[PDB]
Design a protein around this ligand. Sequence first.
Ligand SMILES: CC(C)CCC[C@@H](C)[C@H]1CC[C@H]2[C@@H]3CC=C4C[C@@H](O)CC[C@]4(C)[C@H]3CC[C@]12C
Ligand SMILES: COCCCC/C(=N\OCCN)c1ccc(C(F)(F)F)cc1
Ligand SMILES: *[C@@H]1O[C@H](CO)[C@@H](O)[C@H](O)[C@H]1NC(C)=O
Ligand SMILES: *[C@@H]1O[C@H](CO)[C@@H](O)[C@H](O)[C@H]1NC(C)=O
Ligand SMILES: [Cl-]
Ligand code: NA
Ligand code: NA
Lengths: 218, 214, 544
Amino acid sequence: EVQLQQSGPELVKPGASVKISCKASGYTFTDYYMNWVKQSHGKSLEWIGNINPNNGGTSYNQKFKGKATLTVDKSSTTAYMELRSLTSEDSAVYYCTRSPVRPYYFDYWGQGTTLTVSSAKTTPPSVYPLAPGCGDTTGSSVTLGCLVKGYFPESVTVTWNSGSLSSSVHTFPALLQSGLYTMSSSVTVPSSTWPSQTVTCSVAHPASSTTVDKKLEP
Amino acid sequence: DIVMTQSHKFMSTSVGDRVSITCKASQDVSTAVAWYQQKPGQSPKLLIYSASYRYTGVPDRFTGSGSGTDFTFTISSVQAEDLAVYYCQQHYSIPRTFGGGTKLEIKRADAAPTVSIFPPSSEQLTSGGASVVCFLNNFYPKDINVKWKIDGSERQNGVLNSWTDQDSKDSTYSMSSTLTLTKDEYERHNSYTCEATHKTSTSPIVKSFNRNEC
Amino acid sequence: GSQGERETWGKKVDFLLSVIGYAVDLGNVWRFPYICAQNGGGAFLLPYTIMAIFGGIPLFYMELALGQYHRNGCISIWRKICPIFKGIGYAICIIAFYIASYYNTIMAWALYYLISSFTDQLPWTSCKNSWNTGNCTNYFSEDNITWTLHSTSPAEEFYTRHVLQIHRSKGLQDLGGISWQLALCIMLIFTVIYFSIWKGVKTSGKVVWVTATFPYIALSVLLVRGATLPGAWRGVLFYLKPNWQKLLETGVWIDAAAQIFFSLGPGFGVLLAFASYNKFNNNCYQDALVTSVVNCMTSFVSGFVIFTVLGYMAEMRNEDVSEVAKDAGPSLLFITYAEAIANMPASTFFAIIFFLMLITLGLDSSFAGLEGVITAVLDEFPHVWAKRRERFVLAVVITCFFGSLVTLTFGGAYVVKLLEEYATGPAVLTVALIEAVAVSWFYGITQFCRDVKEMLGFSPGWFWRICWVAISPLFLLFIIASFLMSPPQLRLFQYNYPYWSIILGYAIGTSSFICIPTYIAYRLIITPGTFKERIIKSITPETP
Ligand SMILES: CC(C)CCC[C@@H](C)[C@H]1CC[C@H]2[C@@H]3CC=C4C[C@@H](O)CC[C@]4(C)[C@H]3CC[C@]12C
Ligand SMILES: COCCCC/C(=N\OCCN)c1ccc(C(F)(F)F)cc1
Ligand SMILES: *[C@@H]1O[C@H](CO)[C@@H](O)[C@H](O)[C@H]1NC(C)=O
Ligand SMILES: *[C@@H]1O[C@H](CO)[C@@H](O)[C@H](O)[C@H]1NC(C)=O
Ligand SMILES: [Cl-]
Ligand code: NA
Ligand code: NA
């Protein structure tokens, strides 16, 4: 129904600018206010400002006056928010959310946009398989896993066999060190599908656009 | 402006308990309070609007009350999928502000951490590194000790503990202890061992493997 | 022989309420509460009095003294002070005509709103009418509603699409034609003002008894009504909440100065004409003092009359009275306040007294507005005029009707804004400055204090001499300079005025005072001899 598709993650150097999009569908676009909410890592929501789609009637927050610039395009029903003079504080997840005039609630939100403001080079992730040893006791379930080492920024996706099956996958949060992230994933699958069939972990890095696929081998 | 104050940053409850989150505002609000739900890894979801009214597509178990400055969001029957961070927001005066957020953690019985040790793969030995991995899956609560043993000696350098968020099905935490080492040092030691100390049992779970081609 | 001396007023109270009635109008009711709420709240009370004590009161009293002492019109008084400045007397006249082109049409609206309030069911409550669109959403309707960018309320629909009919014009470019309803209404108004002026100061002095006393009664009823309404404290809080950080901004001082100038209204020839008809030994000091202080107090209680009801309206909706009082115009009374009245018991009553209050708020000021011009013209062309007063008064009322046809159009509100902000304002401030300068720096402030010493029996204090000499001309100069340095960008009813609107406003503004420089050049060009002898016989009053 009502869908708000924002742009992907953005890695931009400090001092530059970045534009985030917001494609709306499923409702009369000229009927609702378009908003932008900034959410910092581990922080609360922060209303940036709204914009009237009929004429571009912007209304910013005093904390974001001169920080964010909201625009709108009626020809394609798409909203935009641009951020200039980027610092470490701007590295956060930004949302664009629909809202009526009264009562002013945010009924539908976008998926968010992970913004990373840093001068660090986009490092491709090193995908190393984490296979159980050959001397372990194969019980009713074996625990497999894959390792991702050295990448930037926090834009990575570790999938397992095109999402089938994934009823026991544990993904561990990435840890940042010496400017590079490092994370790991595991999956508990029964002993009646391994190593008979093909179980392959896929590691995608949208920031560096690098997709390395590694198959687990005992 | 308006300051929405949530005193309790964290609240513990169990599956099936009655849980209520409070929201304190700066000035009088009448009935202009909205309650949003943000599941870990998802976008915020609107649940309550105008103090008490529920939005379309929200189960009946989510309620709202309050009239003035202090408001309360109440859940009668907590489900496993109700695990999320809850926010309150005023919608009368410009600008619209939000609360600090109350991460609702679920309390349950203790669970034994399944410990699994893993030898460095050949692709990493090819690159010129070797990392022994110790996974601790499905336990409760979050408090758990992880001790490393390369060859019986308590290893402390190069250990990284990563705790995941609570689960939304059975409410069990999971963590990963990573021991990152070089290839030259890996090909000079054979049987690695990681042990975990939890409150379910006094004896730490000990896992070991051999480098000599397992 | 023949005429000789002029007539005089019937009673002290008549002139005391005539000047109060002219001073008190719509702006006291709604302009003062809005500008007071959004510019520091209660702290706006501080510069409003300062701009009064130093700017408003000296011009008001100095104008009332010159008028009650010399007993001449707005034109002939300059022949006896500074002949070259006789054009001033003409400028104001032209100014009045512009004001009268719209200020009455406004009253017409109230009148059309008043005659439509005799129905048991008020038109702006339901949406099942012949003028509402599909966006019309009203109350006593299913709860849970949520307002949309295109949704409108029956009150907003009623003002926008029925009485004003502003949707039938595309802006200043295309606004024709004329609505016959508001033409008949404004004709009725020009008739109720006709029989109150045609006889002279006698009828405008008998009608003032009602026009000046009714608004306080209506304001009292609306006050004790709105004070009893639940949640009315929010509007009072937003009305009186001190925001001392606003006082640091140089804008609120200019707002207070302008507000107290137009509210006091010196420099218009009204106080001159009203003061002309009075006793020579009558006191002038106490009169001016009392009248202004009432004009402010009346504004002060009117603030509560508005903000109790708007506070109730913010309580029924969801707070931040700034949200419900965003629009600063007739919509605050005809839409916001009207929609709030419609949701109260005995709505017919509070509507009749509300619109009737508006009409009586306007009437006293249009009475005086005309009184000054009529007195001026009859005194400048005597015995060529005064042959009958009814003839001239009729020619003025009719002229204003034909002059209001531009305002009676579908796009009349656009013309109202343009004339009220870009034309009349800067010109009245200008001519007030010119008058204040001529009386203070040409005729001599010392001789003025001696004339007051002759009339009232005592010379004015040093506080007033020092105010007329320096404080008042700088008081007007500040407002004029502030406006000319940054004219406000005009917007009305989701319609931004074209960029050339200021040129039209300035065009209308400049065509008003072409007479003072062309008349200075005219009289300066007519008197023979050297320029020093012409300006010496032109600055010094006539010898005999
Ligand atoms: C009363 C008299 C003396 C004022 C005349 C001044 C003239 C120059 C002013 C007054 C009104 C103005 C016009 C108002 C309307 C329009 C229509 C617009 O599409 C182009 C600008 C234009 C054409 C303006 C041009 C300048 C203008 C013609
Ligand atoms: C520019 O508009 C402001 C008018 C100020 C004088 C006035 N009314 O204000 C009353 C003071 N509180 C006024 C001026 C002219 C007329 C006229 F009758 F001439 F139209 C009516 C009222
Ligand atoms: C209020 O309005 C929405 C329409 O957007 C409707 O779907 C909803 O069911 C209504 N009621 C409540 C209690 O939210
Ligand atoms: C409601 O208003 C919008 C613009 O304000 C207009 O486009 C629409 O046609 C209107 N609806 C109806 C039913 O007329
Ligand atoms: Cl006032
Ligand atoms: Na006044
Ligand atoms: Na009046």
